[PDB]
Curated annotation (Swiss-Prot):
Gene3D superfamilies: EspG protein, N-terminal domain. Keywords: Hydrolase, Plasmid, Protease, Secreted, Thiol protease, Virulence. Pfam families: EspG. It comes from Shigella flexneri. This is Cysteine protease-like VirA. It is found in: Secreted. Its EC number is 3.4.22.-. One of its GO terms (molecular function) is cysteine-type endopeptidase activity.
């Protein structure tokens, strides 16, 4: 009851990039005349309530603030610190994979932006492995947590495999190759193979994916999302990532030296049209915490412009480090 309203606000919250935000403001929500601003000052979170001209505020304790963090939408905020979100399960050190609740929590949690002032330049090697990267990942998806969405619509994995296959992406395609785009005839085959249902909604989806799928910028957006080094955009990311892996290693040695632990649970990829595309590509490597098998959510978001060609040249030129935003979160079993 009171829970939908709550989750409906909260989603309303967006990162504050605005140049005219309050001091330390990292998020805002503007609801029908009212505005809420969330600010950090020396790591302390305050909430500002703007009803026209009133302006009241509240300073949150560390507890109330972590509660707030867990209820934010899965967006990239400038939190200035990689946080740990607790999932609703008790961990144990006798498992090889995160519990479903940890996976679920990781899928839906906000993350903290790693500032990229010292971003790397485009290199000739960028996106070299992209074709083999998507192949390997889709091949292993039938036991993955991999999910791919266009505009909040799950694209069935079998349909992705059929697409990637007819695009000629396999185990020996040649890294430098530029993908030839599928005819209307070709995609129409796959799409219809994977959408038997005749409902208006399925008919709309069939149409939607028929149009995308012939859009090279879309193919480029989808495939680029799987590049294994997509997120290495700066020394700063390197540094955070190293600190995180060190903590993973320490907890592993400390808590489950003998236990096997899977490395990664796959990609969560959300794609939206702006014709151009916004991509959010999250990788979910496992992360041992003091409670059990958790996840380190690393999310990269970027824009893919309308004329992008599906090749390593097309990709590294369309999606340079400077235009990717990288964010982190740790998700822990309770």
């Amino acid at each position: 009851a009171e829970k939908h309203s709550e989750k409906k606000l909260m989603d309303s919250f967006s990162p504050s990039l605005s140049q005219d935000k309050m001091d330390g403001e990292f998020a805002h929500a503007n609801i029908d005349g009212i505005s809420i601003r969330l600010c950090l000052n020396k790591g302390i979170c305050s909430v500002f309530y703007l009803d026209g001209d009133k302006i009241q505020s509240t300073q949150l304790s560390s507890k109330e603030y972590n509660n707030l963090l867990s209820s934010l939408p899965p967006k990239q905020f400038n939190l200035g610190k990689v946080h740990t979100i607790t999932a609703p399960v008790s961990g144990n050190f006798k498992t090889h994979k995160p519990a479903p609740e940890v996976i679920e929590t990781a899928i839906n949690c906000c993350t903290s932006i790693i500032p990229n002032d010292d971003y790397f330049h485009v290199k000739d090697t960028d996106f070299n492995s992209v074709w083999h990267d998507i192949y390997r990942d889709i091949r292993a998806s039938d036991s993955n947590s991999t999910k791919i969405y266009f505009n909040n619509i799950e694209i069935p994995l079998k349909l992705i495999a059929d697409l990637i296959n007819e695009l000629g992406i396999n185990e020996f395609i040649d890294s430098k190759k530029e993908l030839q785009m599928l005819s209307y005839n070709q995609v129409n085959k796959i799409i219809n193979s994977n959408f038997p249902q005749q409902d208006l909604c399925f008919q709309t989806e069939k149409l939607l994916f028929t149009s995308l799928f012939q859009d090279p910028a879309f193919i480029s957006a989808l495939t680029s999302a799987f590049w294994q080094s997509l997120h290495i955009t700066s020394s700063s990311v390197e540094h955070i990532y190293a600190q995180i892996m060190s903590e993973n290693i320490e907890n592993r040695l400390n808590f489950m030296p003998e236990q096997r632990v899977i490395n990664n649970c796959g990609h969560i990829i959300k794609i939206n049209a702006v014709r151009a595309y916004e991509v959010s590509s999250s990788i979910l490597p496992s992360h041992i915490t003091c409670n059990g098998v958790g996840i380190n959510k690393i999310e990269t978001s970027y824009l893919v412009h309308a004329g992008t060609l599906p090749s390593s040249e097309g990709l590294r030129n369309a999606i340079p480090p400077e235009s990717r935003q990288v964010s982190f979160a740790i998700i822990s079993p309770d």
